Amino acid sequence: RMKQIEDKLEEILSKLYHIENELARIKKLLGE
Amino acid sequence: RMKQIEDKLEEILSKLYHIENELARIKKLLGER
Amino acid sequence: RMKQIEDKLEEILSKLYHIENELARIKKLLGE
Amino acid sequence: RMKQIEDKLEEILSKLYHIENELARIKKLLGER
User: Fold this and answer.
1) Which of A16, A28, B10, C25 sits 20 to 30 Å CA-CA off D21?
2) Alpha-carbon distance D33 to D12, whole Å?
3) D8 vs B23: CA distance, rounded Å
4) What dihedral do alpha carbons D22, D26, A12, D5 form, nearest 10°?
5) Is B12 near chain A, with CB under 8 Å?
6) Dihedral pair phi/psi, residue C30, rounded to 5°
7) What span, in angstroms and rounded, lies between the C-alpha atoms of A17 and A14?
C-alpha cells in the first residue's frame, strides 16, 4: 500500500507546483 | 490506519483545491483591476 | 511505518490551515 | 519506497514553508501599502 500513498503524494506535490505558479502570476501583478 | 491515511490524503487534497481556487480568484481580481 | 506517515500528514494539513489563514488576511486586505 | 515516501513528504513540506513565506511577504506588502 506504499504505491497508492506515493501516488497521492505525487499528486499532492503537483498541486503545490500549480499553487506556486498562481503565486508567480500574482507576485508580478503585485509589482514584485 | 491506512483508511485514516487515505482520509488524510484526501483531506489535504481538498484543502489544496480550495487553496488553488482562492488564489485563482485573487489573481482574476488583480488582473481586471 | 503508517504512524510516521500519518504524523507528517497531520503536519502537512496544519500548514494548509496556516496557509488558509494567510489567504483570509490577504483577501480582506484586498477588499473581498 | 518508504525512503521515497519520506522524501516526498519532505519535499511537500518544503514547498509548504516556501508557499507560506511567499504569502507572508504578499501580506506584508499589502498591509503597508
Assistant:
1) B10
2) 32
3) 24
4) 20
5) yes
6) -95, -5
7) 5
Cell of C28: 480582506
Nearest to B23 among A5, A8, A22 (CB): A22
Declared resolution, Å = 2.3
A11 in contact with chain D, both atoms CB, cutoff 8 A? no
CB A29 within 8 A of CB D29: no
Give the distance from CA A20 to its chain's centroid: 6
Method: X-ray
Q: Are B27 and A26 in contact (CB under 8 A)?
A: yes
- Residue matched to cell numbers 504569502: D23
By C-alpha distance, which of B3, B8, A16 is closest to D8?
A16
Residue B26 has which C-alpha cell? 485573487
Among C4, C16, C22, whose Cβ lies nearest the Cβ of D24? C22
